[PDB]
A paper describes a structure:
To improve the long-term stability of the wild-type (WT) human FAT10 protein, we replaced the four cysteines in FAT10 with Ser, Thr, or Leu depending on whether they were predicted by bioinformatics analysis to be solvent-exposed or buried (C7T and C9T in the N-domain; C134L and C162S in the C-domain). For further structural studies, we designed a Cys-free FAT10 construct lacking the N-terminal four residues (ΔN FAT10; amino acids 5–165) and Cys-free constructs of the individual N- and C-terminal domains (amino acids 5–86 and amino acids 85–165, respectively; hereafter referred to as N- and C-domain). The N-domain crystallized readily and we solved its structure at 1.95 Å resolution by molecular replacement. We could resolve three virtually identical protein chains in the asymmetric unit that superimposed with a backbone root mean square deviation (r.m.s.d.) of 0.66 ± 0.01 Å for amino acids 8–81. Only the N- and C-terminal residues (amino acids 6–7 and 82–84, respectively) display distinct conformations and increased B factors showing that these residues are disordered and not part of the UBL fold. Of note, the side chains of residues 7 and 9 that are cysteines in the native human FAT10 sequence are indeed solvent exposed and only residue 9 is part of the UBL fold. As in Ub, the core of the UBL fold is stabilized by a dense hydrophobic interaction network that is almost void of aromatic residues. Overall, comparison of the FAT10 N-domain structure with Ub showed that not only the structured regions are well-conserved, but also the lengths of the loops except for the α2–β5 loop that contains two additional residues in the N-domain. Interestingly, the hydrophobic patch in Ub (L8, I44, and V70) that is used for most Ub–protein interactions, is neither conserved in the FAT10 N-domain (E15, L51, and K79) nor in the C-domain (S95, T133, and A159). To compare the FAT10 N- and C-domains in more detail and to identify conserved regions, we generated a multiple sequence alignment of FAT10 proteins. This revealed a conserved surface in the FAT10 N-domain that mainly consisted of the β5 strand.
Numbering used by the authors: 4 to 81
Write the structure that this text describes.
């Protein structure tokens, strides 16, 4: 389906599968599995855009791509 590469400042590159129409929250749950960072403390970026957890990757323009590169930041929420 779709392969997601998640790069971060702290950990090795993460790889896992995703669906472009699922919420970004589903990505964060994969990150939580690999890093144990709770979903509420993660921020994901596509390019330089911060993704909102309720939105889908498709809504940010992920259409035909077979592989995408995301950035993870660990952030204490307000």
């Amino acid at each position: 389906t779709l392969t997601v590469h998640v790069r971060s400042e702290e950990w090795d590159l993460m790889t896992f599968d995703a669906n472009p129409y699922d919420s970004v929250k589903k990505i964060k749950e994969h990150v939580r599995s690999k890093t144990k960072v709770p979903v509420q403390d993660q921020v994901l970026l596509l390019g330089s855009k911060i993704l909102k957890p309720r939105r889908s990757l498709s809504s940010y323009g992920i259409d035909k791509e077979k592989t995408i590169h995301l950035t993870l930041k660990v952030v204490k929420p307000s």
